[PDB]
Write a protein that binds this ligand. Structure first.
Ligand SMILES: COC(=O)[C@H]1[C@H]2C=C[C@]([C@H](Cc3ccc(C)cc3)Nc3ccccc3)(O2)[C@H]1C(=O)OC
Ligand SMILES: [Mg+2]
Ligand SMILES: [Zn+2]
Lengths: 304, 487
């Protein structure tokens, strides 16, 4: 049982691996603020908050890390002082350049990358860069009562208790997870067991691609009509009945709600912690939250 | 829509007055979510009382630093104070609990039932958590089914700043797991220099484990009293930011406390249980050497941090559901609490659910599992119509004082009880008005004619609660049991 003690010493080392990990966080809006707070309190070595946008007059006056009346300055700069005060042992850097213009060498300094408020093209490109450098990749967003998290940990090994063993779990790229072939006979069966939040994510990603923005409460009339059109185009492109996503979805997917940010940000940050520490199994590979029904569903989409 | 919410719901949130009971636990995350969601009129109260100052007032000061335009009303008196009557609770459209003290949660449950105000209850236990809604006549209340006491605390409190008294019993139970059990990072007992409140700066020479220092030492009891009760305590004093408003601890010396519940004997018991355990692992609350190790190690730490120690029977009664906390679990639960509150403010109480937070997905891929709220338990002794219980005791040995303090106040969670006998004459046993029935406290129940089958009507007018108590006389039980509730 010599291999038994090799796992035990590697299990207690999980906290040291967490305290030595550096994380990149892109997007410091409602969801990113919660993720940053949870990671900084968790004790990671460093956290880099990257956001190219500035605080707009349409942003809510009450914000977590951004002091009231900061309209005009960078969102990551305004979030620095409050984020750093959460834990002095964590060095919190601030980056203002566009994530899409960063070189590949910029990401190598990080052990994990978490994207929020990014387009589909940026999500895929960064996940491909991270897989190219063996960097753990995460993404998430919130919209109305709904939220989601995605993880791509490649070939991930961890320690789990029975009474303690080591396992391996294989993740797939986000590109394959976002374009699933539903024409197989086995896929059509899993299609009945797949939560509609996955297709809600597809509709909103397509909205963010075309409009260059997320649905807004101010323009709820025009946005909800376009969302109803996009869900017909996207679900027809995948060979699926458009009625798999009910028509009333436009009423519960607008703006970012603070309670939804806390739920999704809590689940996402804990998945990053257990991945950096390589302790406990991670969710493979999607998590979908429905704030209206109280549902938190883990789906494995991509493989096969 | 307004920030994803309908116009009518955002108005109810802006004009709605809510009550948060408890500044600790999930309260910090809950206050953030309430303010960020748009709740302007928030009342905060806890269990402490002043003559800084109270926890609610201290928490209000930190809230206004994050958002100065918040309208926080902080109370410096305990929620158990009789001033917070039903009329007080009727001011709010929603009450959210952040306490873990069972007696206070039972009280708030009864106050919200009497005020017909929805009460959101919750709990945490590591990765696990749950949220539910309590509404009179619709759902089951907090006491429809008994539930264990939540003893889930962050590692920063157990290791660095343990506010008495359960935090030391947890530290003693963590100490048992590190030395004689499955060593875990969530149950470390060493000084937590990663605590963000500590702001630990390394020294010049700084440029280790608790079980390893006992492994090479051969589990020396006198060496384990050292390092753990004097060197770790003197290392806590090097973190100066921890001792600015709270009193700092004082180390214990073995060569002094032994040369001069009992104080100096618990140090002797600490060295006796280590020698027995090293000859023999899973912690068992019915084990002789295991409970003696926890009782001695906890009481030694309770004296280091300046507080009255506790007996062995009280340590055994506690230390049941000791689960280390996970900070993200509080953030998830606090978010669900406000989500359930939005449904209540929307007039859609039927859409409320009991939500379970699991560690891993269930057989149906659900990590967060909702379920329909259960109807009121017809056998609940609190929220049912004309509730009754049966108590088995010796009417010739039980005094009125024992009935008042241990049965009606402790077991049945009444704050200010009035107890009379259903004998036609309305004989008064116990009065909530001080200066009336103190002369009865020493008398046996049989001196008032209470015999087998006697019925006592216990009224708690603050809680708007009436309980009928059937007396079953029994001379068995044993010379250690004074009473027991049937069923
Ligand atoms: C000293 O701590 C406390 O008393 C608690 C209590 C008082 C303040 C506090 C805060 C409440 C809050 C209200 C509004 C906004 C916009 C943010 C936060 N929540 C919190 C939670 C997690 C990380 C940081 C802050 O809730 C919390 C704090 O400031 O933590 C250091
Ligand atoms: Mg009261
Ligand atoms: Zn009940």
């Amino acid at each position: 049982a010599q291999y038994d003690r090799q796992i035990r010493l590697w299990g207690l080392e999980a906290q040291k691996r967490l305290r030595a990990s550096r994380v990149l966080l892109v997007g410091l809006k409602g969801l990113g603020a919660e993720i940053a707070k949870n990671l900084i309190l968790a004790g990671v070595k460093g956290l880099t908050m990257l956001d190219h946008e500035q605080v707009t007059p349409e942003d809510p006056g009450a914000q977590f890390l951004i002091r009231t009346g900061s309209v005009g300055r960078n969102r990551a700069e305004a979030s620095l002082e409050r984020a750093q005060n959460l834990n002095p042992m964590v060095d919190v850097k601030v980056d203002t350049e566009d994530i899409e213009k960063k070189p590949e060498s910029f990401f190598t300094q990080f052990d994990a990358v978490c994207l929020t408020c990014c387009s589909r093209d940026v999500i895929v490109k960064v996940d491909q860069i991270c897989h190219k450098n063996s960097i753990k990749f995460f993404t998430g967003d919130v919209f109305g009562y709904h939220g989601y998290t995605f993880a791509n940990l490649g070939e991930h090994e961890f320690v789990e208790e029975k009474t303690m063993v080591k396992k391996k779990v294989v993740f797939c790229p986000v590109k394959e997870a976002l374009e699933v072939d539903w024409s197989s006979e086995k896929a059509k069966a899993a299609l009945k067991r797949t939560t509609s939040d996955y297709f809600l994510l597809q509709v909103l990603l397509k909205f963010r691609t075309d409009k260059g923005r997320d649905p807004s409460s101010d323009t709820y009339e025009e946005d909800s009509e376009l969302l109803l059109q996009i869900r017909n185009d996207v679900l027809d492109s995948l060979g699926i009945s458009p009625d798999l996503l009910p028509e009333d979805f436009v009423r519960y997917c607008f703006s970012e709600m603070a309670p939804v940010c806390a739920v999704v940000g809590g689940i996402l940050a804990q998945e990053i912690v257990k991945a950096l520490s390589q302790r406990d199994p991670p969710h493979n590979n999607f998590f979908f939250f429905d704030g209206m029904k109280g549902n938190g569903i883990v789906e494995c989409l991509g493989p096969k | 829509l307004s920030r994803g919410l309908p116009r009518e719901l955002a108005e109810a949130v802006a004009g709605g007055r809510v009550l948060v009971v408890g500044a600790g636990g999930i309260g910090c995350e809950l206050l953030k979510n309430l303010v960020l969601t748009g709740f302007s009129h928030i009342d905060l109260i806890d269990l402490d009382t002043i003559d800084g100052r109270s926890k609610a007032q201290v928490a209000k000061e930190s809230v206004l630093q994050f958002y100065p335009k918040a309208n926080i009303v902080a109370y410096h008196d305990s929620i158990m104070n009789p001033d917070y009557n039903v009329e007080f609770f009727r001011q709010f459209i929603l009450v959210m609990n952040a306490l873990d003290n069972r007696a206070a949660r039972n009280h708030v449950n009864r106050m919200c039932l009497a005020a017909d105000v929805p009460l959101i209850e919750s709990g945490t236990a590591g990765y696990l958590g749950q949220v539910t809604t309590i509404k009179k006549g619709v759902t089951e209340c907090y006491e429809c089914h008994p539930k264990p006491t939540q003893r889930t605390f962050p590692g920063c409190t157990i290791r660095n700043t343990p506010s008495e008294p359960i935090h030391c019993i947890v530290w003693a139970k963590y100490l048992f797991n590190q030395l004689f059990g499955e060593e875990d990072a969530d149950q470390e007992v060493s000084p937590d220099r990663a605590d963000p409140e500590a702001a630990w700066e390394p020294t010049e020479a700084e440029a280790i484990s608790t079980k390893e220092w006992a492994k090479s030492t051969g589990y020396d009891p006198v060496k384990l009293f050292t390092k753990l009760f004097k060197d770790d305590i003197r290392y806590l004093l090097t973190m100066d930011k921890l001792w600015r408003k709270r009193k700092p601890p004082v180390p214990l010396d073995w060569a002094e406390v032994q040369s001069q519940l009992d104080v100096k004997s618990y140090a002797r018991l600490f060295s006796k249980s280590i020698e027995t355990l090293r000859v023999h692992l899973i912690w068992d609350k019915d084990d002789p050497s295991a409970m003696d190790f926890v009782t001695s190690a906890a009481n030694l730490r309770m004296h280091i941090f300046s507080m009255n120690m506790k007996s062995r029977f009280d340590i055994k009664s506690m230390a049941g559901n000791i689960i280390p906390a996970i900070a993200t679990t509080n953030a998830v639960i606090a978010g669900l609490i406000v989500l359930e509150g939005l449904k209540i403010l929307s007039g859609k109480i039927d859409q409320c659910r009991t939500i379970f937070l699991n560690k891993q997905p269930n057989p149906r891929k659900k990590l967060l599992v909702p379920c329909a709220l259960d109807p009121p338990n017809p056998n609940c002794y609190v929220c049912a119509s004309k509730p009754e219980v049966t108590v088995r005791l010796n009417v010739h040995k039980v005094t009125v004082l024992t009935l008042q303090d241990k049965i009606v106040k402790e077991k049945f969670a009444m704050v200010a009880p009035d107890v009379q006998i259903e004998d036609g004459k309305g004989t008064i046993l116990i009065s909530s008005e001080e200066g009336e029935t103190e002369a009865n406290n020493h008398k046996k129940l049989s001196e008032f004619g209470i015999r087998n089958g006697s019925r006592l009507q216990a009224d708690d007018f603050l809680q708007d609660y009436t309980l009928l108590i059937n007396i079953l006389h029994s001379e068995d039980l044993g010379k250690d049991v004074e009473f027991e509730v049937v069923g």
